[PDB]
Amino acid sequence: TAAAALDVIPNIYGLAVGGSHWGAPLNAAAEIIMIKYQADSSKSESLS
Amino acid sequence: TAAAALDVIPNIYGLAVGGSHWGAPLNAAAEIIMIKYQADSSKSESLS
Amino acid sequence: VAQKAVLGYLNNFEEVSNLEIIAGYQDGIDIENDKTYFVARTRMQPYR
Amino acid sequence: LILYPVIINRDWPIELDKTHQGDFGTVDDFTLNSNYTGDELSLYLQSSSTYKYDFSKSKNIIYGIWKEDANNNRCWLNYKLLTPEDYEPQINATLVMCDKGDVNIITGFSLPNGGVDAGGKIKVTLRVGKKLRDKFQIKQFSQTQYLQFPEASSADVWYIGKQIRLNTLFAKELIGKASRSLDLVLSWETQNSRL
Amino acid sequence: YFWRSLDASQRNANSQELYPTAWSEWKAISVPLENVANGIVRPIMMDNRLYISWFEVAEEKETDSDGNIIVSGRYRTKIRLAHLGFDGVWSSGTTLREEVLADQMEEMIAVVDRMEDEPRLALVAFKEMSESWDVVFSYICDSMLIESSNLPTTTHPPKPGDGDKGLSDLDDYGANLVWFYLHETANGGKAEYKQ
Amino acid sequence: LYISWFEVAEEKETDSDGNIIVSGRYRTKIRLAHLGFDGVWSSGTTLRE
């Protein structure tokens, strides 16, 4: 989360401006969900 | 770790400057954690 | 191991004790009986 | 400030302002009652100041309440045909007017011509009562967030004037003790700390 | 990066020496520190909590209203801090106040716990070697990670004559502190600072 | 339940004459989300820009 949050800020200066990867936070969130699933699934094994 | 550390440096020169992917180190760290988990989990199998 | 676990819980509880309110909205005109809702965020980054 | 829904008051409109018009007079020249009626406005224009516009000379004077707008739709709402020898006549009209704009009305004396006449009038602006708003307040004192109720003139709902804590600095103790051990945290002293 | 500690207790009562136990193990640090500004860091341990602090900076190519580049160059910079959890793991770390300084203040950091008062406040400062009028940037925090409130008023108020900027109380204080270390140096000349 | 906020960023617009419009301008947009009956947050959405 923090990584994408940081990457929200613009990248470019001078005679041009280039912003940031707008979708990065949402992409991260999706992956976060996946990571949650990953942990959960792994836990089940130990119990079994 | 070293990859992101290297990518900290700026990319762009001339009439403009464009820095670097600010979040890259933190993203790498997260993935590093995941990689640790990956190894650990794999080890358990061999023992079993 | 239990100690580790509880220390983790305590750690999160720190952030709970550090939660800062931001805003609130009343369910209706009768403050003296209508419920109300509130939103708050972490002092520690990343902001949650 | 604490937020809350916008809701129509559904009572007398909020009167905005008044002006006077015609060949004479002042804004003080008529007293207007304007209570709401359920879906409709209702008006009760008690004239004064006939003696400051037209009296005992012009006759069959239209003493009227009539509409106004960006077009001066001076359409008659209610009027009495009289000689303003009666210095303080009264006329009234319920006005459905469910369009929730700012209602403009002319109220006063006119000749049968209904304009450019010695009869004079005042003009009034009315608005739907948006305000059902009431105070409630987030507060800050020292480091802690807190709440307090209004000192309302309302009935003695115990809520009035009360104040409530919102936050705690307990964290400091956790830092100081858990760092070492949970036992220090669990100590009776900790549970009985004057935090 | 790694940290470790050493006790000054654990001597034998007879010995001009300390038990081997006095040396701690070397321990890894998990923070993604490679963004560090200048290969510089300071640890602080207080109230049994360990903290790590540093700063980072990058230049930004700002431009004039006239569209042209402001060729003087300016430096986005920010103060960074992390701490260890009771569970024995490093915080993700965080940023305090930011700045975009008109110059590359970069000559390292000063950090200490303060007891000029009971709160045991946390403070961090940074510097640039104007051998006189040394330039300082700093921040101060309540242990609950709240920017500290009270301070003595500026020794150099804004507009002390044509030095219209003066200083902010915060940095005025921090400057005094670092001066109390790199000019007040009977404890050791400022050349010794690096060690 | 709903949650609402906004976001904005500056864009370096330029004149017909090619030069930069030095006044500066700000792309901005209104954002809203809501909770589902199933007890999970909407992905959120944007209104007028």
- Contact partners of E by the rule of 3+ C-beta pairs under 8 A? A, B, C, D, F
**Which long-range contacts does E21-30 make (Cβ < 8 Å, 24+ apart)?**
E26/E2, E27/E2, E27/E3, E28/E1, E28/E2, E29/E1, E29/E2, E29/E3, E29/E90, E30/B29, E30/E89, E30/E90
Query: Scanning every residue of chain F, which has its alpha carbon at the shortest distance from the alpha carbon of A20?
Result: F9
Q: Measure the CA–CA gap between A6 and A20, rounded to whole angstroms.
A: 10
Token code pair at residue D178: 């858990």
Amino acid at F17: D
Report the residue of D1, D2, D181 to disrupt the C interface, i.e. the one with the largest count of C CBs within 10 Å. Answer: D2
A16: contact with B, CB 8 A cutoff: yes
Q: Measure the CA–CA gap between E125 and E44, rounded to whole angstroms.
A: 13
CA angle (E13 as vertex; E8, E17 as ends), nearest 5: 50
C-alpha of D40 from chain center = 16
Cβ neighbour number for residue F42 with a 10 Å cutoff: 12
Spatial CB neighbours of D175, under 8 Å, sequence gap ≥ 6? C14, E47, E48, E49, E143
Beta pairing class for D90-95 and D137-141? unpaired
CA separation, residue D30 to residues D49, D97, D98, D110, E17 (Å): 7, 22, 25, 14, 103
C-alpha of D164 from chain center = 31
Q: Measure the CA–CA gap between B36 and B1, rounded to whole angstroms.
A: 13
Please, are residues C31 and C8 in contact by the beta-carbon 8 Å criterion? no
Q: Measure the CA–CA gap between C32 and C8, rounded to whole angstroms.
A: 39
CA separation, residue E23 to residues E12, E19, E46 (Å): 15, 8, 19
Report the half-sphere exposure of A27 (CA within 13 A, side-chain side). Answer: 10
A11 DSSP assignment: -
CA separation, residue E22 to residues E4, E16, E18, E46, E189 (Å): 11, 14, 7, 19, 30
E95 DSSP assignment: E
Report the residue of A17, A32, A33 to disrupt the F interface, i.e. the one with the largest count of F CBs within 10 Å. Answer: A17
Q: Measure the CA–CA gap between D117 and D23, rounded to whole angstroms.
A: 7
Q: Measure the CA–CA gap between E99 and A24, rounded to whole angstroms.
A: 25
Resolution (A): 4.6
| CB-count exposure of residue E175 (10 Å: 0-12, 13-18, 19+) | buried
Please, are residues A22 and A31 in contact by the beta-carbon 8 Å criterion? no
What is the nearest CA distance from D168 to chain E, expressed in angstroms?
11
Token code pair at residue E88: 């024995």
Beta pairing class for F2-11 and F25-34? antiparallel
Q: Measure the CA–CA gap between D130 and D7, rounded to whole angstroms.
A: 6
Spatial CB neighbours of D38, under 8 Å, sequence gap ≥ 6? none
**Do chains B and F meet with 3 or more Cβ pairs nearer than 8 Å?**
no
Q: Measure the CA–CA gap between F49 and A21, rounded to whole angstroms.
A: 19
Backbone phi, psi, residue E164, to 5°:
-50, -30
Token code pair at residue D133: 């708003």
Helix ranges restricted to H, chain E: 169-182
CB nearest to D138's CB, from C24, C31, C32: C24
Q: Which H or E run includes B16?
A: strand B16-17
- Contact partners of C by the rule of 3+ C-beta pairs under 8 A? A, D, E
Cα dihedral D105→D109→D110→D112 (10° resolution): 110
Q: Measure the CA–CA gap between D45 and D89, rounded to whole angstroms.
A: 8
Q: Do A19 and F9 touch (CB under 8 A)?
A: yes
Backbone phi, psi, residue D118, to 5°:
-60, -30
D41 DSSP assignment: E
What is the nearest CA distance from E58 to chain C, expressed in angstroms?
21
A23: contact with F, CB 8 A cutoff: no
Q: Give which of E137, E98, E105, E124 is closest to E43, Cα–Cα.
A: E124
Q: Measure the CA–CA gap between E58 and E38, rounded to whole angstroms.
A: 11
Spatial CB neighbours of F12, under 8 Å, sequence gap ≥ 6? A16, A17, F20, F24
Q: Cis bond leading into E43, ω under 30°? A: no
What is the nearest CA distance from D137 to chain C, expressed in angstroms?
10
Token code pair at residue F33: 């989300």
What is the nearest CA distance from A45 to chain B, expressed in angstroms?
10
Q: Measure the CA–CA gap between D60 and D112, rounded to whole angstroms.
A: 7
Q: Measure the CA–CA gap between B22 and A8, rounded to whole angstroms.
A: 9
Report the residue of C44, C47, C48 to disrupt the E interface, i.e. the one with the largest count of E CBs within 10 Å. Answer: C44
**Per-residue b/e over E98-132, b at no fewer than 16 CB within 10 Å?**
ebebeeebbbbbbbeeeeeeeeebbbbbbbbeeee
Report the residue of D1, D3, D4, D182 to disrupt the C interface, i.e. the one with the largest count of C CBs within 10 Å. Answer: D4
Q: Which H or E run includes B2?
A: helix B2-6
Contacts of F10 in chain E (CB under 8 A): none
Q: Measure the CA–CA gap between D191 and D29, rounded to whole angstroms.
A: 73
Q: Do E86 and C44 touch (CB under 8 A)?
A: no
Cβ neighbour number for residue E172 with a 10 Å cutoff: 20
CA separation, residue D120 to residues D69, D89, D123, E91 (Å): 18, 14, 10, 80
Contacts of A13 in chain E (CB under 8 A): 60-62
A30 three-state secondary structure: helix
- Contact partners of D by the rule of 3+ C-beta pairs under 8 A? C, E
**Do chains B and A meet with 3 or more Cβ pairs nearer than 8 Å?**
yes
Q: Do C28 and D4 touch (CB under 8 A)?
A: yes
Token code pair at residue E116: 């000029």
Q: Measure the CA–CA gap between C36 and F33, rounded to whole angstroms.
A: 19
CA separation, residue E151 to residues D180, E110, E114, E172 (Å): 32, 18, 13, 10
CA separation, residue D70 to residues D21, D67, D101, D103, D105 (Å): 16, 11, 12, 11, 12
**Per-residue b/e over A18-27, b at no fewer than 16 CB within 10 Å?**
eebeeebbee
| Residue E168 Ramachandran class (φ > 0 left, ψ -120 to 50 alpha, else beta) | beta
Q: Give which of D146, D181, D185 is closest to D166, Cα–Cα.
A: D146
E112 three-state secondary structure: strand
Q: Do C14 and D132 touch (CB under 8 A)?
A: no
Contacts of E69 in chain A (CB under 8 A): 14-15
CA separation, residue E129 to residues E107, E108, E135, E167 (Å): 7, 10, 7, 17
Query: Scanning every residue of chain F, which has its alpha carbon at the shortest distance from the alpha carbon of E65?
Result: F22
**Do chains F and A meet with 3 or more Cβ pairs nearer than 8 Å?**
yes
Token code pair at residue E189: 């000349």
What is the nearest CA distance from F37 to chain A, expressed in angstroms?
19
Q: Measure the CA–CA gap between E96 and D46, rounded to whole angstroms.
A: 68
Token code pair at residue A28: 């991260």
Contacts of E66 in chain F (CB under 8 A): 22
Please, are residues E55 and E66 in contact by the beta-carbon 8 Å criterion? no
Token code pair at residue B8: 């900290």
Please, are residues D74 and D106 in contact by the beta-carbon 8 Å criterion? yes
Q: Which H or E run includes A28?
A: helix A24-47
Please, are residues E55 and E41 in contact by the beta-carbon 8 Å criterion? no
Beta pairing class for C36-41 and D14-21? unpaired
What is the nearest CA distance from A9 to chain E, expressed in angstroms?
12
Helices and strands: H and E segment counts in chain E: 1, 10
Token code pair at residue D20: 């006077």
Contacts of D169 in chain E (CB under 8 A): 144
Q: Give which of D10, D5, D162, D166 is closest to C35, Cα–Cα.
A: D5
Tokens 């060949």 correspond to D23
Please, are residues D122 and D50 in contact by the beta-carbon 8 Å criterion? no
Please, are residues E123 and E111 in contact by the beta-carbon 8 Å criterion? yes
Interface size A-B, in CB pairs within 8 Å, comes to 41
Please, are residues C28 and C36 in contact by the beta-carbon 8 Å criterion? no
Q: Measure the CA–CA gap between E63 and E70, rounded to whole angstroms.
A: 5
**CA-based end-to-end distance of chain A:** 32
Q: Give which of D176, D181, D170, C46 is closest to E45, Cα–Cα.
A: D176
CA separation, residue D170 to residues C25, D47, D186, E18, E43 (Å): 27, 69, 14, 38, 25
C13 three-state secondary structure: helix
Amino acid at E9: S
Spatial CB neighbours of E188, under 8 Å, sequence gap ≥ 6? none
**Do chains D and B meet with 3 or more Cβ pairs nearer than 8 Å?**
no
A34: contact with B, CB 8 A cutoff: no
Query: Scanning every residue of chain C, which has its alpha carbon at the shortest distance from the alpha carbon of A4?
Result: C46
Q: Cα-atom radius of gyration of chain F, to the nearest Å?
A: 17
Please, are residues E56 and E40 in contact by the beta-carbon 8 Å criterion? no
